């Protein structure tokens, strides 16, 4: 076992990838690394190999609960269906799958479309400049998940505070991170209480009923599913949307090609998920439950692998000219939503939310450009997902 390399390679800056990722794919070897917290790990950079760590049966995500899990975050996160294996993974996903399928999300399309129109109504009337994050990205992603889940979006001034603590690598101290985590779990319980006495028609009303009526999940399990879907919908989705809007505003002909022929939106959304390296560095660690040889390494039983999914999204044996954004790319087998068993549940909700939002922003604002130099756009740091802090625009 080699001397561990400090991981992450450094602060992930803007939408840039550190050069070591490209070196590692070509070497075809895993990098023994020492991460800021938890066990030592093997970094996985190749697409062909990150697929294996993300979904192979010999790689466990539940067995990471019995370890000081290799991570960037100070405290280990209860990750709901993300931190479990079958059978519990099947049992937990079965309760939210149909509402997050392609069909169920298509039923949501008029509301997202109607909301995007109401948000773009707001910008049209107010005039430039607009911070697209405050006035478009956050309300659309925030109102969408709050409505589907049943969270009052009108309490966001309260859970946005706790929400960020779940993305923190270095931005928050350990005690503020744990304090925020408990506060969010308490408020989520405040929401589940209301569904016992006052059932609701939303994702939240339906899953408490499965707990009380079917015993399909535990109370901690119920709170876990509710928490990760608010984290994912309210923040992870907005980060990808603000990042994708930043990409299109700084490479404006790609914005102009999508605008002039808008029927490229499904590929353009897929390409935007592939090209933007949303993950600051790696996704959740897996631990081998037996020996798996990959990346020139015999990963032994109990050893951690860290999936560098954005590096796998630039893999040249898989995507041609992968460092160049191609909104017209037809076959786009990227891993921005994961791969296999833990493939992103809100995969379709992001697609419908992204394709509807980019198209109308372009359709309604054809002259839209950044109001500050692309380097002057502030970005989040010490967080698990990349996003601009603001997106000042003009049109
Ligand atoms: C652009 C926005 C998003 C991106 C890029 C994204 C990305 C991902 C990725 C990469 C994974 C797999 C992690 C792994 O395999 O280790 C995943 C799984 C998951 N996603 Fe997302 N996500 C986004 C938004 C959402 C939304 C809106 C929801 C639901 C409201 C959601 C819910 C989930 C859940 C529950 C899992 C765990 C699924 C499982 O464990 O089987 N995500 N997501
Ligand atoms: C796998 N999804 C990640 C995510 O949304 N991560 C967010 C912060 O890391 C929200 C989150 C915390 S636990 C958990 C469990 C399942 C889904 C989300 C979360 C992506 C950044 C790759």
TrEMBL record:
Family of the protein in this entry: Belongs to the cytochrome P450 family.
InterPro entries with a match to the protein in the record: Cyt_P450, Cyt_P450_B, Cyt_P450_CS, Cyt_P450_sf
Natural source organism: Streptoalloteichus hindustanus
Keywords, comma-separated and alphabetical: Heme, Iron, Metal-binding, Monooxygenase, Oxidoreductase
Name of the protein: Nocardicin N-oxygenase
Annotated heme b binding sites: 89, 93, 283, 286, 342, 344
Database matches in Pfam families: p450 (PF00067)
GO molecular function terms listed in the Swiss-Prot or TrEMBL record: heme binding; iron ion binding; monooxygenase activity; oxidoreductase activity, acting on paired donors, with incorporation or reduction of molecular oxygen
């Amino acid at each position: 076992t080699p001397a561990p390399v400090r991981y992450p390679f450094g602060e992930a800056v803007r939408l840039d990838l550190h050069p070591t990722y490209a070196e590692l794919r070509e070497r075809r070897t895993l990098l023994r690394v020492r991460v800021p917290h938890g066990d030592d790990a093997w970094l996985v950079t190749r697409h062909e190999d990150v697929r294996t760590v993300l979904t192979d049966p010999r790689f466990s995500r539940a067995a990471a609960a019995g370890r000081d899990e290799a991570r960037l975050t100070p405290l280990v996160i209860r990750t709901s269906v993300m931190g479990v294996d079958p059978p519990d993974h099947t049992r937990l996903r079965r309760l939210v799958a149909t509402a997050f399928s392609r069909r169920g999300v298509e039923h949501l399309r008029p509301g997202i479309t109607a909301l995007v129109r109401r948000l773009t109504d707001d910008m049209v009337g107010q005039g430039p400049p607009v911070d697209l994050v405050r006035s478009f990205v956050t309300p659309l992603s925030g109102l969408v998940i709050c409505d589907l889940l049943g969270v009052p979006y009108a309490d966001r001034s309260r859970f946005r505070h706790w929400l960020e603590a779940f993305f923190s690598i270095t931005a928050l101290p350990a005690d503020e991170v744990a304090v925020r985590i408990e506060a969010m779990y308490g408020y989520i319980a405040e929401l589940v209480a209301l569904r016992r006495a006052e059932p609701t028609e939303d994702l939240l009303g339906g899953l408490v009923r499965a707990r009380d009526r079917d015993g399909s999940c535990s109370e901690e399990e119920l709170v876990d599913l509710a928490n990760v879907l608010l984290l994912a919908g309210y923040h992870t989705t907005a980060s990808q949307l603000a990042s994708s809007l930043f990409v299109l505003l700084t490479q404006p002909e790609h914005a102009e090609l999508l605008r002039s022929r808008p029927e490229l939106a499904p590929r353009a959304v897929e390409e935007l998920l592939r090209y933007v390296p949303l993950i600051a560095h790696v996704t959740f660690a897996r631990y081998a439950t037996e020996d798996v040889w990959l990346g020139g390494t015999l990963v032994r039983a109990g050893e951690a692998v860290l999936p560098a999914v954005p590096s796998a999204n630039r893999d040249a044996e898989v995507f041609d000219e992968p460092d160049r954004l191609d909104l017209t790319r037809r076959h786009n087998p990227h891993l921005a939503f994961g791969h296999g068993l833990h493939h992103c549940l809100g995969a379709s909700l992001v697609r419908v939310q992204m394709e509807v939002a980019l198209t109308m922003l372009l359709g309604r604002f054809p002259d839209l450009a950044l109001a500050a130099p692309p380097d002057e756009v502030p970005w989040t740091r010490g967080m698990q997902a990349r996003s601009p802090l603001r997106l000042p625009v003009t049109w």
